Symmetry: D2
């Protein structure tokens, strides 16, 4: 089983989760509690699930990504007492039903991936809301949705946004999301990136990482944006900025990373050159309008696994990766094992934080406590065998005084 | 044209934001009747900031951030332009302080401070300044830390805007901003190879990271020291090696301090350095590298080169210090690229105008630069570069604010 | 379309030079009446090279470079196109050799070799091949070394063109050519973080340098091992750390061999590796990392992942090997980018045409690819990209050839 | 004296020359011989001169770069018995006379920098040719001139081209010439390079290093060439290639590194944008036609030290660095100390090689012997405390055999 092998592989390179398991498996702090999860299911996230289980939690999972009927990772999890609900295709109806099945187990805590499970809890299953003590949300898209929910006054449980900690800087780095995205694009196209015009839509944490990686690969990077401050940063970073309607005319690759909808229009698409490659790095598959592609294409064909060709009225053919879905997850390895280990440790401690403090907390979206960022950093340094400096007594006094040393 | 005027002429063709600001307020002269007191590194770029404020109607009174960094020809050019200048390049500390007092004796309405010196003096020794001071714009992290400490003791009386910490400090402290100017200063004064050398950067905040990223771009083996676990992990994830300074000094070819702290190197650390090691400070005050310690423990002290002091030690080894432990990119370099300072200065002018407009509704505390100023300056920059960007549609606006 | 045909379809839209060559010789069919025997990694890109030669009139007979790397659907697609294919993906060594013999039994006029195997067999065991063989085009450094050794013994009988060593090996072995395909193969099969890890690259010739440069671009701490002082100094000047392999293995997270030599890791070196170390070979033959040694000294051997073998040792530590010590970018990756292979293959077609035209005036020795072929292919590439360059004037030509 | 200080500074960071002096100063192998040199004179080259003197040679120097009348380095050299002829301005007449003065001393060996001293020896001072036993030429331009001289059959002494060894790769590297060039441009302009269009004319060893450094600084690099192979390499390296007449229309910086003449034409110059900066990295000041600039400029003014402004008929103003002369030497530090140490060790051993073998050698241009490259590399590793691997007996047999291991 590649799946059991992959879980064993992953476990060997997730030192933080291993440390957490070794530290708390005997005390089992989550014993008697149920953690529900909506996540992209594969070996890495399976290990998060397993760690929570070792800590005593009853884990209930729903995988958003379609899985083969005898998926090795799902089976490994089930053999450990972990419940796993999956779907076979991108059928929204089944996806909704699977979310409901997780809620049917009345989770005490939820680890959400985009805010779906939380939102549906507040709009369709209020009975579950009463037992729900807290939510840990991973993505920028999910946090945005939940902050908007809080805005209306409808939010009824504490939410910890793990997304915006001191270390989202690690997750979206050029070595985090940046490289995983380009690895998925290159492995599925075998095309040379050096010298090519790469358009990246959005220059936030995700897009910047993707743009920096492309440049490091020799690409000529072009950035599109709606925020002047971000555009200027791209320019200062050495990239070219222009409107998308202009960028598409010269694009060899177009990568969306905005977290917005319809970043490409029909007109935009009809400007692309024959052979152009499109991919989405945002959370939902609405950035590149796949429905529009389907509708205006004279013909659609499979060019390679994970790559769809679309010939248009202008006779040109453009290619889409992973049907416009999160390319690094849907057609790649997601993020490096050690990067997920870091993200997962933050999420596990967030859940423990909610367990210890949900009553004291209010039904609003909280930033991840600083103490958690520092605890994970200290553990990471320990696992690396790295030592750093400490402040001296004189330095402590210097830093808090306004008077001059002299 | 005199050399001072020539330096200013050069700079003015590459400062589009300041030029746009002058044109935009040429008629209105918003600062007419107001005195802006300044304490900054006096060179052509800062002189252009002073000239622009003067064009907006302000009476500008300026002094150097350190007498040593003051360029006399630029000062003389500013004087011929009607600007009041209290600053002469000098080693005399008493004269320096005296010049800060002269600026305060002009009772400025607003102060553009560099290190918090004018503001601290105003709240402790020269409170008469408080009869007319309405707000302060502070440029450096060190200044902000000092003013927050002043606030904490309850002595602060006017609002302070930290232009420092903004959405555009990612530009000032960029590898292409502070990073490159720091390395240009080091390379021009040592002519030493950077590729393959062990470069120790103390501190991994904005300044140190830019410095470390540039060193790596030059081929160095970068080692970062820190006291904050989160920053240390950040450096490791950026690809750098992290270890305690006491271990780093044993293999260092270069040690650059960028912490904003004092005594980053101990006497013991110094005695562990190898012969020929080069030390430089990129932090605001000359306390990061203990210059007094080097002086005391050295058997011999000599000029090895212009801007480079050699200290031969009890262990027979000699180590070298650039610019007497002072801010290296400014004391032995060009500061920052012109276009980078143009942006920073546009932000400072709008900070002063923002104080002029809202100081009465602000408490005596440190305020982060308002977001609308960042956006305003960014749009001016895009306009100046002739760059067009996209605009959200109604569907997109609805999408972004929806939770479904 | 069948999957083999689909793979070839994809590749053909991104191979402009091969497409230009087909169009350029469509009528002439210069290779009509000639058989070109091939031994190469059988995938879509090499299949397109075969198809292009067929379009120039050649009877093409091809076999895999290693049965394991042969893609059966691509092979079947080639057969449906009239090309003779002797190659089935297999672990059986005897069947592999048998397939090389079948290619030789077609008595090729020209051979495109990969590692010198066909050529060596032709000059030692199957000399009947020499009744019709007129020239060989060898792609790899290892092949060239072997054929030069064959030449040295006096057994070589036909001219050999080393397409390898040319003005455009700087492209094939570029950080964007071999470098990135090597790392994509390693990252896709381990999903391990590269930034901050110790990456040991054994050998600093063209291949190793590209690999080291890409590793550094990914944030790795790169360590290079070498036996040639000039190459070691080169690595140091490029910014890398250099040390003996016996010291490098103690801290290595990754060890990549790119030397073209045998036993780059000793048993002692292997027992010094840390638990979890990852080993991969980018050299032509699977002898760089001693696979037989790992097998013999291992207490446990298991599949850790697809393309990854785990070997638990007597010291209780486990080390991992990618693709059984075989050429990693080919055995567990996509080889090289399409456009890179298009260039390499254009050079090989012109090498064969050059042999067709000049083999009688060439000795049985290894010849570097003729410079005019490099220029011809470069012009075709510029034309294809629609790039225009400058042209020397009469004054400039006179200047360049003048000594005054 | 900054000059004596600078010589002392340089000596501390030139481990190879120090090793050479320590090794041979007692034997003084060059005792009784005269080494004439035509070089750019500053602290670093002074140290080459001093090392030869410590080895026993009578050194006679002529500095091509104008020097102040009481130049500290020249005075330091004279106080050591080294003869130094200098000029005060860019007066060709005085430059020629200084070359003659070096020849007047009848050197046994010549270290040339551009081929001038050697060429004039073969066309005006044949009496000196008889005693001249060999020449070591440093630059690409000088080697080209001397190879052309050999071509006519006029060459009468052995010439070792140090330029084309295994290590010209170190001298022209992005960290060698590349960075020194950009440091001179940035220190003399204070302009931001990130985002700017940088045109580099010529993609040989020098230009490539300059282009790679510019990209590393965030520039958008544009390359011009006359050799298709080089153009393609630039493209594969991720840069844009186009004709100069087109490149100049968008250039913020134009750097010539071709070793050719008139890389910019009047028409080209009139296409430059207001504020454009021009600099030459080639050996002779003919790449950017300064005479043409002087002639067509409505007015010429000093903008900054080392920077001349030229306002043209189209009302635009363009700026030239160091009067179109080798920018990194004429307005910068040349090359890093350790890089020159390497180049100088190669040149010292070349002179010793000529001393030992000039009779056996023929009057042609020789490549630097491989043994010298390897000797300097071994010494460099030794000074760095670096150890490498050695071939095993099995490996030696493997490498020379055509048979398969299996
Ligand atoms: N593939 C992956 O592994 C990852 C995916 N993401 C997803 O990527 C998206 C963005 O992530 P972040 O960068 O953290 O959000 P962000 O807010 O930091 O960056 C979003 C940027 O997109 C720009 N933008 C919005 N609409 C645009 C449009 N129509 N055209 C051009 N630019 C536009 C915004 O101005 C903003 O600067 C989210 O959906 C997030 O969940 C985030 C991290 C990793
Ligand atoms: N040279 C220049 O042009 C510039 C200078 N600066 C100056 O550099 C200093 C830092 O600026 P920022 O990075 O914005 O401050 P910062 O607070 O953002 O980063 C400072 C870092 O130093 C670390 N640190 C403190 N003490 C340390 C020690 N003893 N050893 C190692 N690390 C230590 C802290 O943990 C922190 O991460 C200030 O003095 C600032 O005024 C800032 C920007 C540009
Ligand atoms: N994976 C791929 O796609 C490619 C593979 N190759 C293969 O890689 C190998 C080398 O290719 P090249 O770089 O062109 O050969 P090369 O001769 O140009 O460089 C080989 C280097 O390895 C060094 N070396 C030899 N034995 C060593 C040892 N025991 N330890 C450390 N260093 C050692 C040599 O001193 C030499 O500098 C060959 O097998 C070649 O066929 C070449 C190009 C691409
Ligand atoms: N500033 C410095 O420190 C250094 C200066 N140089 C000087 O730079 C020049 C070139 O050095 P190399 O790169 O070693 O010679 P090179 O022969 O390796 O490169 C010269 C390149 O310029 C191209 N070229 C010729 N004419 C051209 C034109 N009109 N337009 C565009 N491209 C053209 C050629 O095709 C060739 O690729 C020589 O004068 C050399 O002495 C060399 C090394 C360092
Ligand atoms: Na299964
Ligand atoms: Na620890
Ligand atoms: Na107030
Ligand atoms: Na022949
Ligand atoms: Na003097
Ligand atoms: Na040694």
């Amino acid at each position: 089983n590649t799946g059991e092998m992959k879980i064993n592989w992953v476990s060997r390179y997730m030192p933080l989760l291993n440390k957490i398991a070794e530290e708390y498996s005997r005390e089992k702090p989550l014993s008697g509690f149920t953690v529900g999860m909506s996540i992209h299911l594969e070996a890495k996230t399976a290990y998060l699930a397993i760690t929570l289980s070792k800590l005593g939690a009853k884990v209930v999972i729903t995988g958003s990504n379609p899985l083969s009927t005898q998926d090795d990772v799902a089976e490994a999890l089930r053999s450990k007492g972990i419940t796993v609900y999956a779907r076979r295709t991108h059928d929204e109806s089944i996806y909704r039903e699977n979310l409901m099945k997780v809620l049917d187990e009345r989770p005490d805590f939820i680890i959400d991936d985009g805010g779906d499970l939380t939102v549906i809890s507040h709009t369709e299953r209020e009975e579950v809301l009463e037992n729900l003590k807290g939510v840990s949300e991973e993505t920028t898209t999910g946090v945005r949705r939940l902050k908007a929910l809080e805005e209306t006054g409808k939010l009824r449980v504490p939410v910890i946004a793990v997304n915006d900690s001191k270390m989202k800087y690690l997750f979206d780095n050029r070595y985090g999301t940046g490289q995983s995205t380009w690895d998925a694009i290159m492995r599925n196209t075998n095309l040379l990136v050096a010298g090519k015009n790469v358009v990246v839509a959005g220059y936030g944490w995700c897009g910047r990482g993707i743009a920096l990686r492309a440049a490091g690969l020799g690409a000529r990077v072009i950035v599109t944006e709606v925020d002047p401050v971000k555009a200027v940063e791209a320019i200062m970073d050495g990239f070219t900025v222009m409107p998308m309607k202009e960028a598409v005319k010269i694009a060899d690759f177009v990568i969306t990373a905005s977290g917005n909808t319809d970043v490409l229009s029909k007109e935009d698409i009809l400007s692309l050159k024959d052979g152009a490659v499109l991919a989405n790095a945002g959370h939902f598959n609405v950035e590149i309008p796949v429905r529009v592609l389907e509708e205006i294409a004279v013909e659609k064909f499979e060019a390679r696994p994970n790559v769809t060709g679309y010939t248009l009225e202008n006779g040109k053919t453009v290619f889409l990766l992973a049907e416009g879905r999160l390319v690094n997850l849907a057609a790649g390895d997601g993020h490096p094992v050690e990067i997920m280990d870091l993200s997962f440790a933050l999420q596990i401690f967030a859940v423990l934080y909610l367990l210890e403090n949900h009553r004291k907390m209010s039904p609003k979206v909280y930033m991840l406590p600083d103490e958690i960022d520092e605890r994970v950093a200290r553990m990471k340094l320990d696992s690396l065998g790295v030592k750093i400096d400490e402040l001296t007594e004189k330095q402590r006094r210097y830093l808090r005084s306004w008077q001059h040393h002299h």
